[PDB]
Amino acid sequence: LRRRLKYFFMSPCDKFRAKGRKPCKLMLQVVKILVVTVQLILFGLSNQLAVTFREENTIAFRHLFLLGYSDGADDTFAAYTREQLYQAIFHAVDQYLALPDVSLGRYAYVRGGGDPWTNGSGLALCQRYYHRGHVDPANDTFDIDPMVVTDCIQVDPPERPSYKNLTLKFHKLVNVTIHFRLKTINLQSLINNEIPDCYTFSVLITFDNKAHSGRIPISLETQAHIQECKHPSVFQHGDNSFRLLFDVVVILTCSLSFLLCARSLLRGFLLQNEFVGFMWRQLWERLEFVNGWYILLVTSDVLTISGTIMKIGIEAKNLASYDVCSILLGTSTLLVWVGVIRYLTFFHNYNILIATLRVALPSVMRFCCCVAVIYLGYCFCGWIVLGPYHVKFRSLSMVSECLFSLINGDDMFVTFAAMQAQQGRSSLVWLFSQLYLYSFISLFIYMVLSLFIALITGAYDTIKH
Amino acid sequence: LRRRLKYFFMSPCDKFRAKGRKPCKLMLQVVKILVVTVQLILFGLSNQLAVTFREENTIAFRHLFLLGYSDGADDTFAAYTREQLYQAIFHAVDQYLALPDVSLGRYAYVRGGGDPWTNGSGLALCQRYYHRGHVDPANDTFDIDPMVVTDCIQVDPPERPSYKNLTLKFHKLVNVTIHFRLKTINLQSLINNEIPDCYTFSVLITFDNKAHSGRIPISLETQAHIQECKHPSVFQHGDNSFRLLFDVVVILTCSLSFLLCARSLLRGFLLQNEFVGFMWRQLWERLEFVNGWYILLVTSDVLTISGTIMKIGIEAKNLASYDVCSILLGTSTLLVWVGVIRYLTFFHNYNILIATLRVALPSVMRFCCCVAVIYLGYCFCGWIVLGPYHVKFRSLSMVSECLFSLINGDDMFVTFAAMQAQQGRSSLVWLFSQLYLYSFISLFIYMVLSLFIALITGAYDTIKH
Amino acid sequence: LRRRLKYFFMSPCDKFRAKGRKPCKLMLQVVKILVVTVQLILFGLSNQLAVTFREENTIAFRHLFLLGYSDGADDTFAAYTREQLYQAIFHAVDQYLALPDVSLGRYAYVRGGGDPWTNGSGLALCQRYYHRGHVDPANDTFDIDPMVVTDCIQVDPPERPSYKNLTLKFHKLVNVTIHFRLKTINLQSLINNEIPDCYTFSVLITFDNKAHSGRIPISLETQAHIQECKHPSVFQHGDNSFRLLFDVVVILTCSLSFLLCARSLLRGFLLQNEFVGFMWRQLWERLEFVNGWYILLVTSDVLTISGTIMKIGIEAKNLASYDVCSILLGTSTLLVWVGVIRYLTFFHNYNILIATLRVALPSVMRFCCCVAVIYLGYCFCGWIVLGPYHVKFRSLSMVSECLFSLINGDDMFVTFAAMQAQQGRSSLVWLFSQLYLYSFISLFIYMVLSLFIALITGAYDTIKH
Amino acid sequence: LRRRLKYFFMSPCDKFRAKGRKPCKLMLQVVKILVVTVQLILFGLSNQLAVTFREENTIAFRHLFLLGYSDGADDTFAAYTREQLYQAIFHAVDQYLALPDVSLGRYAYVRGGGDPWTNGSGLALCQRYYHRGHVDPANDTFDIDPMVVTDCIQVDPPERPSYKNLTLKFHKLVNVTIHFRLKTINLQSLINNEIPDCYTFSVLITFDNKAHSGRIPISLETQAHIQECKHPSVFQHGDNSFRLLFDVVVILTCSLSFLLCARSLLRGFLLQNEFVGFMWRQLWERLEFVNGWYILLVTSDVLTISGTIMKIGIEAKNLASYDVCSILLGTSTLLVWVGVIRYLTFFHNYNILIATLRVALPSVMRFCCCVAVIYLGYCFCGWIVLGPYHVKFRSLSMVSECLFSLINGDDMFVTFAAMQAQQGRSSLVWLFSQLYLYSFISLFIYMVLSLFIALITGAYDTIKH
Ligand SMILES: CN(C)S(=O)(=O)c1ccc(S(=O)(=O)Nc2cccc(Cl)c2N2CCCCC2)cc1
Ligand SMILES: CN(C)S(=O)(=O)c1ccc(S(=O)(=O)Nc2cccc(Cl)c2N2CCCCC2)cc1
Ligand SMILES: CN(C)S(=O)(=O)c1ccc(S(=O)(=O)Nc2cccc(Cl)c2N2CCCCC2)cc1
Ligand SMILES: CN(C)S(=O)(=O)c1ccc(S(=O)(=O)Nc2cccc(Cl)c2N2CCCCC2)cc1
């Protein structure tokens, strides 16, 4: 029983010395490191193809339909005169009508079946304005009914083998939007021997006048919908037997690993039950009886199996979720690579990181319990006060990123100098920004981070003795 | 009496064990954390609306009135020929006269009632020059009377249901300025259900020839003056009863918290007086009798109350001070979030930061007493010497920011390379910059910051034992 | 024998005290420091000339042959309409045909003798397309044979004392490439008194349609082939006797140093053999009998000799491998400068770095054995998942550089903000990027790097006592 | 005698306790801190005026005379066709001839009296080419005589109340340069009440064809020569009695401080002599008898006096050396501010920095003796090898700056990614750059800097006990 515990907690090498047992688990892990990473790279090929197709098509759409658009300046691209706005709208519609003989890609028109489009309509030109707006800055009066009324113009694609009478209602205009859909085939998914899928891009061009500030920003956004094409033909394409068989091999390897890990977990549970019965005959250690590396391994096994099933679906053309498949496979690869420290824990010369973390975690958790309220106060204050003026405080996640980078001494002078323009106008906000940044930087770089590192190194000093 | 001191210095949990007292103060603080942050976000909505309106209107004005202006290049935008200057001025005036049928926003003209404008004048075209200037570089002579004479041209807005004869006097010109005012309504303050305010933008276009260097920079600045509109009408607007009631709720919560904190402070003062009388019967500790977290809490309470009153005024349209209101509310939110460490001080496992700071503060103050004179010497020297040549040393605050960023290892190579242009011309200044930067960086990163962190970590080592 | 060991392990100064022996080895090293660095600089002159000629010629070719090309934007330079593509191609060919009377450099045409060019052809205009492509996005069908067929047009340079009928086959176009060669003489290799070499630039202009996304990027790449000119004449050029004699001097100095170092190594081997025989009469220390600074010195000697031979070949016009010669000479210079710490090892006040490294190396190796699997897991995951979306994760080496910079707190906010565009589209990938970056930064800056520095400083603390 | 030593080494406060002596030296230092800084700022005003005039005039000259010049792109501005070069040259000459009626500044022409200009010539148009050049890349031959022949065209300014026949000899052209001088008056030196000086700008426009690579960069450089104008007149200018009297006050304060410091030094020398005589009756401590703060104070006094004399000369219009005056005054201000630590040395609670440095200096010097050879090897290798390819390794000072910034973790990813272009072409150089950067960063950030900080903190630990 005590020798049973000895055997159960023995290292793999001394286990092999004891019973001449070849570490089948270790061999499975070693081959798992290679198979999971190879599968991740092979999937990454197709993921790159799909993302590249989407992004390059969006860039081509911007250059085709936005008048005067240049690379960069996706923001700071607006209309400032009525003639500029009219020219932008009419250029977008004209380029839509002239696509098939001016574009470098081959696109197909989608006749209306959806929300803005009527039957036969390919492009919907909608302007939205207040139901009743009497804006008169001269007499400081306005009688406004802020109910948005939508007025759409339907444009039919030319049939080859009205929209220019648009009055825009500038004083109460909310926004002008252009909706159309384009079908295209991802032919680049042919160097990878996968067959080309059929894509449908839903293009939305927005002329945003919600601020009513005399500046109307213009943006173009696309949504891509992948689906299989109808009875396609590729000359001597062949099969992807190798890809399918490798996916099956990865599935089987991860299944064997999962089964062995679950068997070891259940054996440890039975031994824990027997030992607690022994003690009763004669609750923070019975949990210590359990192996957390096996929890990590089973989590990684289920992640890899889910990712491989999703990838098989993607290659069989049913489920087009490249982001989900990539996230699953990448997380499983990371956990698989991390899980080899398990065989460095026994040596006591190689597990310095693991032992130091195990000792340092509670103190770090309490220190974080305090630093969290400090950090959240600073985040909320910075967000709300400096957000309208600072480009790095626009949203809460952006504020968190900026402050976390400042703690590590990144972009400090840029953060300071993004308010030199406000030094002259809103000098009070500029002075508040100075005090806020100086206080946060001093307190967190010099007082808090020092104590964090001190806790970690003190735990290391405890471990090494 | 000693048990009275025991009770007075007991933690909240042991206080509840002692007298079964529910920590009403703690409950008030907990709900205060939520109410103050929610109020800060709700105010931030309107603050964002106002700041966005101002900035976007200024950008639209720049693009409308500055000839050849593009986004970016707010600096490095100048005239270099007489024809360029004349075209810029005439384009600005022509765009002013053509606004109502070319701009995307709706603006109203303001007839003259102020400093540069006469009765009926909307735009004032003023050039300023020396009273008598005879500049003759050929004979190296000049008879100059440097009294600035102002010559203004008044332009009346077109009345719909002379300025081109401007001689500019280039050889003694000081500056040319264009003044006009525009009224507009912030209609975007309607998605927030607040009613639109009436704004008046005072636009100033400056053609600055003060350097007399053949380059005349052009800039546009605006001042926005918010006021309520006259008898406006919004169809089914409703009230902001919820906003007003939540402001009242925040006020009442902060008032209760302030009253409890002041009661505890006065009780502690009475106990201190009683104890000192006891000692006299039988001055750095009687102050220690006092709670600094209650000082922080009362400061936060008064800040929150002032901010809420100002916000109520803003929503009632009387006081338009968004920067002051935002600064008050953000500072109060930061202090409110910081004030929960007060309940982590008792545990002795969570107040590592507070104890380390309490021990480390005096040594840090003395070390700063020395490093302050070192830092100020470096700041003044850098400012005056490298200011004309370095873009990051233009002003004293900018020098302080640059040096503080250099201490944290930020923008080091950019700071070094901003003088590669001066390596060839003013090689002496380039060499001085090299020595200055190397010396400052070495001395402060390696000698001073190391001792600062050493003081803080030594105080931590004192605390943890 | 023991006094023999004393003499063999004595420092140079005490050796001179013992036998009055002038350290000829030390003198050779001292003069070697100067000769190797001077030779490296002298070679760097010619290396700079050659690299400058190549790069400036490539820039001139880009500006000459790429229509609408501006400095910068080597990427983000593409065609988006059929007319743009045709104009770019025809402009490239027209500039090729008009070079000799429009270019600022003097170039010669190379009639065809190679792969794309026929006899007499100077420029080859090749378009590549699928052998059979029936792309029809309207019916979601395609009958494709993905065998690339090449169609080349041959252009003959004008003879001074057809290509415009190009149909491009857009729907199945793979790429369009322009191949031509230009000969020129590097006249700038005359201020260095070396004679001008004759260069042949092979220019390749690519119009890449492999993505079939409606955007065709355009790039220009050149390959330079250096060779000696036929019977050139420079008036009173003179010889490079000084350069050749200095190369011979460097060779002789390094040869003497190599001979002395090998003699000392063989003497140490003989002494080790004698001592081990002594012990046998009476395996990790017999290797310690050996001097690793002499291994470093012989490696540096052979590197310097190889580099000098290659440099002599370069100046004698036979072997044009400037990159190989520069790498050899620079590595030898670095090792030569490093090799003077050998005379600081004896003092025990100056070899703190060497002793600390000697003590700290094994623990660092084991810690790296663990951190390597952690780092590789993170690298693979980041590469495959964030590569399509993040500009700093495009390739595996780029991922390694990005993560290594993040460990040192560089470009943190830029890395975080390169996904704000994906926050809206692919919010799942944006959230994964947030978690990935936060986890990696925390774990490696705060836990791993702290323990690395702790190991190094603990080894130092061991040494200093 | 021993009480004499007690008095001589007593602190100022205990000296005042001893003999009731008011610290006149301390009072002089305190007023010196203010007077020197005020003088530095007052001089910085005029220094800023002069530097601003020079730089803005150079910018105006660039925009006036360089065809197609835009802000930025001072580099990457070149000609690539013969027509571009001719148009640039002719535009420069035409703008020179049309200055007085197109420029915004008032300039005067300088008829020839110097090197390139003949009598009456204002502009010299010189082209330089090889004396005999027969460049023939077709036959791989050239008969060249590399003696530069200069051919200048003289242009006379128009007389108001030939250069277009320029043949450029492209195949053997070395460079084309345009020389002319312009006189102007710095009128901005009138808001400071200093009178305007007369400036003479020597403009040099270079068309550099030294590389013979088909790309000819174009640059403009100016040299400014300040001198007093002839009998100028400013209406009611007044005197600068205040400035002169304040300069005299600074001179007198620094003179009194210097006299007291030298008296104390000589008294200490006499006491040292007496003590050594005492010891002889009964050499590293007799130097310790001396005060280094008095050496620093006398250095600062002589620097301030020299700077004030130079500033008086500048304001009296004799010596125009603003860079020298600024460097002297700024260095003196820095030393003056540093010299107050002298009164914090006695307290033993405020001189932690000084004591730590005094203890740590020798070990730091030896560690630097080793790290210096390591750093120099890396600097030379990086310079010569990566210089032609990396933008941050172009010169030796730039290499030193880049490596020093890398040690502090600055611009790491930018330094890594400046070779992604060379990954494809010169992959060997790219791989060498990878190895070089990784090795340098690891060795210096993790091994060397750690031991440097360890030495400094160990000296602090010695001091604090
Ligand atoms: C950055 N330093 C180590 S710090 O200055 O000492 C510090 C700052 C902020 C907190 S936190 O409680 O607010 N949590 C938090 C918030 C944002 C980003 C992150 Cl990664 C964190 N983590 C810190 C590491 C453990 C996991 C949580 C704690 C310490
Ligand atoms: C940056 N390091 C910790 S440092 O190199 O050791 C150091 C530098 C400068 C001084 S200072 O006396 O001049 N004060 C000062 C000046 C500018 C910005 C700031 Cl935040 C400060 N504060 C330092 C932290 C406490 C509050 C004051 C002291 C230490
Ligand atoms: C950066 N820190 C010191 S670290 O966070 O503690 C750390 C990170 C990564 C590893 S590694 O095992 O993966 N090796 C590795 C991978 C990429 C670049 C480099 Cl230079 C290395 N070297 C680290 C220094 C010794 C030589 C190898 C180890 C420590
Ligand atoms: C940067 N760290 C502290 S370091 O990695 O430990 C280190 C790097 C380089 C040397 S050096 O001997 O080559 N001298 C040197 C060369 C360039 C710039 C500078 Cl500021 C220096 N100084 C270092 C501080 C004292 C004065 C000299 C020494 C230490």
PDB file of N, CA, C and O and ligand atoms in Angstrom, chain C residues 364-365 367-376 400 404 407-408 444-445 448-453, chain D residues 438-439 441-442 446-447, ligand 3:
ATOM      1  N   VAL C 364      21.104  27.973 -16.195  1.00  0.00           N
ATOM      2  CA  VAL C 364      20.476  28.677 -17.304  1.00  0.00           C
ATOM      3  C   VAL C 364      20.086  27.697 -18.402  1.00  0.00           C
ATOM      4  O   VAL C 364      19.021  27.824 -19.012  1.00  0.00           O
ATOM      5  N   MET C 365      20.925  26.690 -18.655  1.00  0.00           N
ATOM      6  CA  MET C 365      20.609  25.713 -19.695  1.00  0.00           C
ATOM      7  C   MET C 365      19.365  24.904 -19.342  1.00  0.00           C
ATOM      8  O   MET C 365      18.526  24.644 -20.206  1.00  0.00           O
ATOM      9  N   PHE C 367      16.869  25.812 -17.143  1.00  0.00           N
ATOM     10  CA  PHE C 367      15.760  26.752 -17.205  1.00  0.00           C
ATOM     11  C   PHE C 367      15.338  26.993 -18.647  1.00  0.00           C
ATOM     12  O   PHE C 367      14.141  27.057 -18.952  1.00  0.00           O
ATOM     13  N   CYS C 368      16.310  27.102 -19.556  1.00  0.00           N
ATOM     14  CA  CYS C 368      15.996  27.236 -20.970  1.00  0.00           C
ATOM     15  C   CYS C 368      15.390  25.961 -21.535  1.00  0.00           C
ATOM     16  O   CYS C 368      14.564  26.035 -22.441  1.00  0.00           O
ATOM     17  N   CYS C 369      15.785  24.793 -21.027  1.00  0.00           N
ATOM     18  CA  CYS C 369      15.159  23.551 -21.473  1.00  0.00           C
ATOM     19  C   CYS C 369      13.653  23.572 -21.232  1.00  0.00           C
ATOM     20  O   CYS C 369      12.883  22.992 -22.006  1.00  0.00           O
ATOM     21  N   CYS C 370      13.219  24.211 -20.146  1.00  0.00           N
ATOM     22  CA  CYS C 370      11.770  24.317 -19.916  1.00  0.00           C
ATOM     23  C   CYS C 370      11.140  25.485 -20.689  1.00  0.00           C
ATOM     24  O   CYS C 370      10.098  25.339 -21.368  1.00  0.00           O
ATOM     25  N   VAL C 371      11.757  26.661 -20.592  1.00  0.00           N
ATOM     26  CA  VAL C 371      11.220  27.840 -21.252  1.00  0.00           C
ATOM     27  C   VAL C 371      11.199  27.665 -22.763  1.00  0.00           C
ATOM     28  O   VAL C 371      10.416  28.325 -23.447  1.00  0.00           O
ATOM     29  N   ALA C 372      12.004  26.749 -23.304  1.00  0.00           N
ATOM     30  CA  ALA C 372      12.021  26.530 -24.744  1.00  0.00           C
ATOM     31  C   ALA C 372      10.737  25.872 -25.220  1.00  0.00           C
ATOM     32  O   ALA C 372      10.179  26.273 -26.246  1.00  0.00           O
ATOM     33  N   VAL C 373      10.248  24.864 -24.497  1.00  0.00           N
ATOM     34  CA  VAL C 373       8.990  24.252 -24.903  1.00  0.00           C
ATOM     35  C   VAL C 373       7.843  25.232 -24.702  1.00  0.00           C
ATOM     36  O   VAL C 373       6.933  25.320 -25.543  1.00  0.00           O
ATOM     37  N   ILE C 374       7.889  26.026 -23.625  1.00  0.00           N
ATOM     38  CA  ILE C 374       6.835  27.031 -23.450  1.00  0.00           C
ATOM     39  C   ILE C 374       6.844  28.026 -24.614  1.00  0.00           C
ATOM     40  O   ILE C 374       5.804  28.319 -25.228  1.00  0.00           O
ATOM     41  N   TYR C 375       8.032  28.529 -24.953  1.00  0.00           N
ATOM     42  CA  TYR C 375       8.177  29.541 -25.991  1.00  0.00           C
ATOM     43  C   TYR C 375       7.795  28.994 -27.358  1.00  0.00           C
ATOM     44  O   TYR C 375       7.189  29.702 -28.165  1.00  0.00           O
ATOM     45  N   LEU C 376       8.136  27.734 -27.638  1.00  0.00           N
ATOM     46  CA  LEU C 376       7.796  27.150 -28.931  1.00  0.00           C
ATOM     47  C   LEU C 376       6.296  26.928 -29.063  1.00  0.00           C
ATOM     48  O   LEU C 376       5.724  27.154 -30.139  1.00  0.00           O
ATOM     49  N   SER C 400       8.824  34.890 -33.763  1.00  0.00           N
ATOM     50  CA  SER C 400       9.874  34.783 -32.757  1.00  0.00           C
ATOM     51  C   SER C 400      10.427  36.155 -32.396  1.00  0.00           C
ATOM     52  O   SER C 400      10.637  36.456 -31.217  1.00  0.00           O
ATOM     53  N   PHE C 404      10.079  37.824 -28.708  1.00  0.00           N
ATOM     54  CA  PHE C 404      11.316  38.174 -28.023  1.00  0.00           C
ATOM     55  C   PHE C 404      11.361  39.660 -27.692  1.00  0.00           C
ATOM     56  O   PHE C 404      11.910  40.056 -26.659  1.00  0.00           O
ATOM     57  N   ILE C 407       8.981  40.198 -24.661  1.00  0.00           N
ATOM     58  CA  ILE C 407       9.602  39.833 -23.389  1.00  0.00           C
ATOM     59  C   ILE C 407      10.411  40.994 -22.827  1.00  0.00           C
ATOM     60  O   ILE C 407      10.488  41.174 -21.606  1.00  0.00           O
ATOM     61  N   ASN C 408      11.011  41.804 -23.696  1.00  0.00           N
ATOM     62  CA  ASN C 408      11.766  42.972 -23.269  1.00  0.00           C
ATOM     63  C   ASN C 408      10.922  44.240 -23.258  1.00  0.00           C
ATOM     64  O   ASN C 408      11.476  45.342 -23.173  1.00  0.00           O
ATOM     65  N   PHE C 444       5.899  35.631 -19.147  1.00  0.00           N
ATOM     66  CA  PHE C 444       7.307  35.706 -19.506  1.00  0.00           C
ATOM     67  C   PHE C 444       8.024  36.907 -18.913  1.00  0.00           C
ATOM     68  O   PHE C 444       9.187  36.776 -18.514  1.00  0.00           O
ATOM     69  N   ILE C 445       7.387  38.075 -18.833  1.00  0.00           N
ATOM     70  CA  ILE C 445       8.071  39.212 -18.232  1.00  0.00           C
ATOM     71  C   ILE C 445       8.160  39.054 -16.722  1.00  0.00           C
ATOM     72  O   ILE C 445       9.195  39.354 -16.119  1.00  0.00           O
ATOM     73  N   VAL C 448       9.102  34.311 -15.766  1.00  0.00           N
ATOM     74  CA  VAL C 448      10.237  33.606 -16.353  1.00  0.00           C
ATOM     75  C   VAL C 448      11.492  34.472 -16.339  1.00  0.00           C
ATOM     76  O   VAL C 448      12.562  34.035 -15.894  1.00  0.00           O
ATOM     77  N   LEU C 449      11.384  35.708 -16.829  1.00  0.00           N
ATOM     78  CA  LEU C 449      12.549  36.583 -16.897  1.00  0.00           C
ATOM     79  C   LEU C 449      13.081  36.895 -15.504  1.00  0.00           C
ATOM     80  O   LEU C 449      14.298  37.014 -15.306  1.00  0.00           O
ATOM     81  N   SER C 450      12.180  37.025 -14.528  1.00  0.00           N
ATOM     82  CA  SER C 450      12.602  37.248 -13.151  1.00  0.00           C
ATOM     83  C   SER C 450      13.462  36.099 -12.646  1.00  0.00           C
ATOM     84  O   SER C 450      14.494  36.324 -12.011  1.00  0.00           O
ATOM     85  N   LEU C 451      13.067  34.858 -12.940  1.00  0.00           N
ATOM     86  CA  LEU C 451      13.850  33.713 -12.486  1.00  0.00           C
ATOM     87  C   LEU C 451      15.161  33.583 -13.251  1.00  0.00           C
ATOM     88  O   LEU C 451      16.163  33.140 -12.683  1.00  0.00           O
ATOM     89  N   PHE C 452      15.176  33.958 -14.531  1.00  0.00           N
ATOM     90  CA  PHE C 452      16.429  33.982 -15.281  1.00  0.00           C
ATOM     91  C   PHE C 452      17.431  34.938 -14.640  1.00  0.00           C
ATOM     92  O   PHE C 452      18.581  34.566 -14.343  1.00  0.00           O
ATOM     93  N   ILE C 453      16.999  36.177 -14.399  1.00  0.00           N
ATOM     94  CA  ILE C 453      17.874  37.163 -13.773  1.00  0.00           C
ATOM     95  C   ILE C 453      18.248  36.718 -12.364  1.00  0.00           C
ATOM     96  O   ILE C 453      19.361  36.977 -11.892  1.00  0.00           O
TER      97      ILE C 453
ATOM     98  N   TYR D 438      20.293  38.543 -31.843  1.00  0.00           N
ATOM     99  CA  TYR D 438      19.903  37.684 -30.729  1.00  0.00           C
ATOM    100  C   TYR D 438      21.033  37.546 -29.718  1.00  0.00           C
ATOM    101  O   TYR D 438      20.815  37.688 -28.506  1.00  0.00           O
ATOM    102  N   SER D 439      22.253  37.295 -30.199  1.00  0.00           N
ATOM    103  CA  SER D 439      23.388  37.122 -29.301  1.00  0.00           C
ATOM    104  C   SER D 439      23.658  38.389 -28.501  1.00  0.00           C
ATOM    105  O   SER D 439      23.822  38.338 -27.276  1.00  0.00           O
ATOM    106  N   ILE D 441      21.656  40.939 -27.806  1.00  0.00           N
ATOM    107  CA  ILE D 441      20.581  41.277 -26.882  1.00  0.00           C
ATOM    108  C   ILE D 441      20.623  40.372 -25.663  1.00  0.00           C
ATOM    109  O   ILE D 441      20.588  40.849 -24.524  1.00  0.00           O
ATOM    110  N   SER D 442      20.741  39.058 -25.873  1.00  0.00           N
ATOM    111  CA  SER D 442      20.786  38.139 -24.741  1.00  0.00           C
ATOM    112  C   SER D 442      21.968  38.450 -23.832  1.00  0.00           C
ATOM    113  O   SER D 442      21.802  38.684 -22.627  1.00  0.00           O
ATOM    114  N   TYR D 446      20.767  40.367 -20.396  1.00  0.00           N
ATOM    115  CA  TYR D 446      20.541  39.378 -19.351  1.00  0.00           C
ATOM    116  C   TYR D 446      21.779  39.061 -18.524  1.00  0.00           C
ATOM    117  O   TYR D 446      21.651  38.817 -17.322  1.00  0.00           O
ATOM    118  N   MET D 447      22.975  39.083 -19.111  1.00  0.00           N
ATOM    119  CA  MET D 447      24.188  38.759 -18.370  1.00  0.00           C
ATOM    120  C   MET D 447      24.951  39.987 -17.890  1.00  0.00           C
ATOM    121  O   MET D 447      25.369  40.036 -16.732  1.00  0.00           O
TER     122      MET D 447
HETATM  123  C1  LIG E   3      14.295  36.310 -22.648  1.00  0.00           C
HETATM  124  N1  LIG E   3      14.529  35.748 -21.331  1.00  0.00           N
HETATM  125  C2  LIG E   3      15.889  35.728 -20.824  1.00  0.00           C
HETATM  126  S1  LIG E   3      13.487  34.503 -20.823  1.00  0.00           S
HETATM  127  O1  LIG E   3      12.093  34.936 -20.771  1.00  0.00           O
HETATM  128  O2  LIG E   3      13.746  34.116 -19.438  1.00  0.00           O
HETATM  129  C3  LIG E   3      13.742  33.130 -21.975  1.00  0.00           C
HETATM  130  C4  LIG E   3      13.058  33.120 -23.177  1.00  0.00           C
HETATM  131  C5  LIG E   3      13.258  32.081 -24.066  1.00  0.00           C
HETATM  132  C6  LIG E   3      14.142  31.069 -23.743  1.00  0.00           C
HETATM  133  S2  LIG E   3      14.401  29.719 -24.917  1.00  0.00           S
HETATM  134  O3  LIG E   3      14.643  28.455 -24.221  1.00  0.00           O
HETATM  135  O4  LIG E   3      13.186  29.427 -25.672  1.00  0.00           O
HETATM  136  N2  LIG E   3      15.705  30.136 -25.941  1.00  0.00           N
HETATM  137  C7  LIG E   3      15.651  31.351 -26.742  1.00  0.00           C
HETATM  138  C8  LIG E   3      14.627  31.518 -27.658  1.00  0.00           C
HETATM  139  C9  LIG E   3      14.559  32.667 -28.430  1.00  0.00           C
HETATM  140  C10 LIG E   3      15.519  33.653 -28.283  1.00  0.00           C
HETATM  141  C11 LIG E   3      16.544  33.489 -27.366  1.00  0.00           C
HETATM  142 CL1  LIG E   3      17.779  34.759 -27.180  1.00  0.00          CL
HETATM  143  C12 LIG E   3      16.616  32.339 -26.596  1.00  0.00           C
HETATM  144  N3  LIG E   3      17.700  32.190 -25.635  1.00  0.00           N
HETATM  145  C13 LIG E   3      17.566  32.647 -24.188  1.00  0.00           C
HETATM  146  C14 LIG E   3      18.914  33.006 -23.571  1.00  0.00           C
HETATM  147  C15 LIG E   3      19.866  31.915 -23.677  1.00  0.00           C
HETATM  148  C16 LIG E   3      20.052  31.469 -25.044  1.00  0.00           C
HETATM  149  C17 LIG E   3      18.739  31.075 -25.710  1.00  0.00           C
HETATM  150  C18 LIG E   3      14.834  31.083 -22.544  1.00  0.00           C
HETATM  151  C19 LIG E   3      14.635  32.123 -21.656  1.00  0.00           C
END
